[PDB]
Design an enzyme around this catalytic site. Structure first.
Site, PDB file in Angstrom:
ATOM      1  N   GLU A  21       0.826  -1.205   0.000  1.00  0.00           N
ATOM      2  CA  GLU A  21       0.000   0.000   0.000  1.00  0.00           C
ATOM      3  C   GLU A  21       0.841   1.228   0.000  1.00  0.00           C
ATOM      4  OE1 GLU A  21      -3.080   0.402  -0.645  1.00  0.00           O
ATOM      5  OE2 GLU A  21      -3.978  -1.590  -0.285  1.00  0.00           O
ATOM      6  N   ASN A  63      -7.656   9.196  -5.874  1.00  0.00           N
ATOM      7  CA  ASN A  63      -8.458   8.225  -6.606  1.00  0.00           C
ATOM      8  C   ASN A  63      -9.244   8.976  -7.705  1.00  0.00           C
ATOM      9  OD1 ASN A  63      -9.047   6.936  -3.312  1.00  0.00           O
ATOM     10  ND2 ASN A  63      -7.876   5.984  -4.879  1.00  0.00           N
ATOM     11  N   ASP A 121     -12.377   9.001  -8.251  1.00  0.00           N
ATOM     12  CA  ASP A 121     -13.620   9.564  -7.718  1.00  0.00           C
ATOM     13  C   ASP A 121     -13.397  10.835  -6.929  1.00  0.00           C
ATOM     14  OD1 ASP A 121     -12.676   8.593  -5.284  1.00  0.00           O
ATOM     15  OD2 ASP A 121     -14.307   7.330  -4.912  1.00  0.00           O
ATOM     16  N   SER A 169     -11.655  11.065  -4.054  1.00  0.00           N
ATOM     17  CA  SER A 169     -11.246  10.731  -2.735  1.00  0.00           C
ATOM     18  C   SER A 169      -9.704  10.571  -2.754  1.00  0.00           C
ATOM     19  CB  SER A 169     -11.890   9.431  -2.264  1.00  0.00           C
ATOM     20  OG  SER A 169     -11.570   8.356  -3.056  1.00  0.00           O
ATOM     21  N   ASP A 216      -6.401   8.411  -0.587  1.00  0.00           N
ATOM     22  CA  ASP A 216      -5.913   7.407   0.378  1.00  0.00           C
ATOM     23  C   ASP A 216      -4.697   7.952   1.137  1.00  0.00           C
ATOM     24  OD1 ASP A 216      -7.808   5.629  -0.835  1.00  0.00           O
ATOM     25  OD2 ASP A 216      -6.247   4.665  -1.953  1.00  0.00           O
ATOM     26  N   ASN A 252      -9.054   5.419   2.974  1.00  0.00           N
ATOM     27  CA  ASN A 252      -9.751   6.282   2.008  1.00  0.00           C
ATOM     28  C   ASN A 252     -10.707   7.271   2.670  1.00  0.00           C
ATOM     29  OD1 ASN A 252     -12.389   6.419   0.065  1.00  0.00           O
ATOM     30  ND2 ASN A 252     -10.593   6.321  -1.054  1.00  0.00           N
TER      31      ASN A 252
END
Ligand SMILES: [Cl-]
Ligand SMILES: [Cl-]
Ligand SMILES: [Cl-]
Length: 129
Positions: A35, A46, A48, A50, A52, A59
């Site tokens: 990750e 991301n 969309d 959002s 992380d 998220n």
């Protein structure tokens, strides 16, 4: 902070992740490697809109507030910037809520694709725990 492998395994064990919801410690270390490359400061945006955050790439659509993800939830009740700290406490506490949500560690894409079904004990081999 960029953790070493066994330093993070020890920190995760101290914070109660070993065998949490039946996931052995090596699963958590593997997830963190893929990750974030063990970097607490990692961020990734991301499609969309959002983002992380942190060592486990939590998220902002669901889990933390960053002020810029409209219509999102903040289920961990924390600013997303708290997830960037050298102290992993907030990330671990949030991760425990995520893994209890019904999909287990499948919430973490890199875990599903790169750790699940592999010899995850390798990730803690050699470490003093
Ligand atoms: Cl393990
Ligand atoms: Cl949010
Ligand atoms: Cl599960």
């Amino acid at each position: 902070k960029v953790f070493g492998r066994c330093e993070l395994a020890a920190a995760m064990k101290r914070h109660g992740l070993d065998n949490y919801r039946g996931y052995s410690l090596g699963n958590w270390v593997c997830a963190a490697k893929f990750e974030s490359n063990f970097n607490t400061q990692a961020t990734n945006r991301n499609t969309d809109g959002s983002t992380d955050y942190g060592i486990l790439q939590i998220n902002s659509r669901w889990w933390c507030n960053d002020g810029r993800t409209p219509g999102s939830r903040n289920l961990c009740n924390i600013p997303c910037s708290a997830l960037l700290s050298s102290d992993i406490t907030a990330s671990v506490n949030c991760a425990k809520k995520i893994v209890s949500d019904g999909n287990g560690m499948n919430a973490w894409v890199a875990w599903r694709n790169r750790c699940k079904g592999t010899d995850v004990q390798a990730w803690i081999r050699g470490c003093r725990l």
